[PDB]
Amino acid sequence: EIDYKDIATLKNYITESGKIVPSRITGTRAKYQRQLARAIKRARYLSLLPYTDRH
């Protein structure tokens, strides 16, 4: 998570639709969620992850 290249252990947090899952469903400890969401978003821009299923 600390990075984005972690595409492997990253998609796990994001849903099928590419949408990042909250916490009441995960519990990735808020403090880390910050780095999580930021990492994912900035990553999708590198084609490492799809902005959404459709495209």
Partner: peptide, 12 residues
């Protein structure tokens, strides 16, 4: 890290 070739999630 020369990742070289790699499939793209979304088409650019």
């Amino acid at each position: 890290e020369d990742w070289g070739r790699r499939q793209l999630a979304y088409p650019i």
